[PDB]
Amino acid sequence: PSKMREYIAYAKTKRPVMSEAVNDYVVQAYIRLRQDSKRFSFGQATPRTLLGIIRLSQALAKLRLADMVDIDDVEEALRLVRVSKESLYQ
Amino acid sequence: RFDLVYLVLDKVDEKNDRELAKHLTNLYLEDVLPVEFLTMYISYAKEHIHPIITEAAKTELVRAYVGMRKMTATTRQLESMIRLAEAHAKMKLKNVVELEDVQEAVRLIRSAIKDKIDMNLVQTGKSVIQRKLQEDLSREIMNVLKDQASDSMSFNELIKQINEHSQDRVESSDIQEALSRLQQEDKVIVLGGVRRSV
C-alpha cells in the first residue's frame, strides 16, 4: 500500500490531454449506446455517461504514465460500463 | 402560478446527438461571450430601465388573449404576457413596450404551453368518465334494490359488481370519489363499509 500510494500521487499530476482519435472514436460508441438505450430499468445513455467514459479513460491514461494515450485505452473504459449494465441485468 | 413551464425533453436522436457528443468532448481539446460584462449589463439594466405599455401594444395584448380564449386561456396568461412583454422591452433597454415585443411574449408562451389547463388534475376525457361512474352507481344500486332483498350491499360486493363486468377497470378510489359527491347530492347513505339507497 505505501508503494501503491507513492505511485498514485505521481501518476495523478500528469493530467493527460486529448488525442484526436479519442474524440473521433468515443462518439462512435456513445451513439450506439444511445441507440441501444432506445431499445427494463433506468440504465440509459445520459451525457453523464459520456463524461464518465472521458474521466474513466483519463484515470486509465494516468495509470500508464503518459502525456496522452491511444484508444487501446478507451475500449477498456467502455468495458467497465458494459460489464456494469450486464451486472444490473445479472 | 408559474409564468412559464418548459418541458426540457428530447428523445434519443442521432442527428442531434452526433453534434451534442462532439460538442461536449470539444471542451478537452486545448491548453461572442461577455463572460462578466453580461452580469454587469443585467445589473445596469435592472438599475436603469423601467418600461411602460404603449396604446399600440394594448390592442395586440387583447387581440392575442382573445385568440387564445377562442382557441383554453385563463387571465393568468394575460398577466404573464403583460409582465414578459415588459421584460422583453427592458431587454434591448427600450424603456417602452411595443407590438414587436408583445409578439415574442406570446410566441414564448405558445412554445411553452402548446409546445383544458388541467385544474384539479381533471381532463375532459376523465370528467365524462366520473359522470358515467355517477350514473353507474345510480343504476347498479337501483337494479339491486329491484332484485335483491335489500337496498344496501357490502363494499366487497360493490367492487364485485362495479369492477368485474360493468366497465373498463375502475379502482376503489374513483368509486369513493363519485359516491362522496353523491353524499353531497344526498342520494345514498354511507354507514361506518355499509352503503344504503335513499
Curated annotation (Swiss-Prot), chain A:
Location(s), subcellular: Cytoplasm; Nucleus
Annotated protein name in UniProt: DNA replication licensing factor MCM7
Signal peptide start-end: none
Origin superkingdom: Eukaryota
Function description: Acts as a component of the MCM2-7 complex (MCM complex) which is the putative replicative helicase essential for 'once per cell cycle' DNA replication initiation and elongation in eukaryotic cells. Core component of CDC45-MCM-GINS (CMG) helicase, the molecular machine that unwinds template DNA during replication, and around which the replisome is built.
Organism: Saccharomyces cerevisiae (strain ATCC 204508 / S288c) (Baker's yeast)
Ligand binding (ATP 2): 48
Other remarks on this protein: Present with 166 molecules/cell in log phase SD medium. Early fractionation of eukaryotic MCM proteins yielded a variety of dimeric, trimeric and tetrameric complexes with unclear biological significance. Specifically a MCM467 subcomplex is shown to have in vitro helicase activity which is inhibited by the MCM2 subunit. The MCM2-7 hexamer is the proposed physiological active complex.
Protein family membership: Belongs to the MCM family.
Residues of the full protein shown: 635 to 729 of 845
Record's subunit section: Component of the MCM2-7 complex. The complex forms a toroidal hexameric ring with the proposed subunit order MCM2-MCM6-MCM4-MCM7-MCM3-MCM5; loaded onto DNA, forms a head-head double hexamer. Interacts with CSM1 and MCM10.
UniProtKB/Swiss-Prot annotation, chain B:
Localization of this protein: Nucleus
Protein origin, superkingdom: Eukaryota
Placement of sequence motif Arginine finger: 1-3
Assembly, per entry: Component of the MCM2-7 complex. The complex forms a toroidal hexameric ring with the proposed subunit order MCM2-MCM6-MCM4-MCM7-MCM3-MCM5; loaded onto DNA, forms a head-head double hexamer.
Function noted in UniProt: Acts as a component of the MCM2-7 complex (MCM complex) which is the putative replicative helicase essential for 'once per cell cycle' DNA replication initiation and elongation in eukaryotic cells. The active ATPase sites in the MCM2-7 ring are formed through the interaction surfaces of two neighboring subunits such that a critical structure of a conserved arginine finger motif is provided in trans relative to the ATP-binding site of the Walker A box of the adjacent subunit. The six ATPase active sites, however, are likely to contribute differentially to the complex helicase activity.
Miscellaneous notes: Present with 8800 molecules/cell in log phase SD medium. Early fractionation of eukaryotic MCM proteins yielded a variety of dimeric, trimeric and tetrameric complexes with unclear biological significance. Specifically a MCM467 subcomplex is shown to have in vitro helicase activity which is inhibited by the MCM2 subunit. The MCM2-7 hexamer is the proposed physiological active complex.
Family: Belongs to the MCM family.
Protein name: DNA replication licensing factor MCM4
Source organism phylogeny: Eukaryota, Fungi, Dikarya, Ascomycota, Saccharomycotina
Gene designation: MCM4
Shown segment, full-protein numbering: 701 to 927 of 933
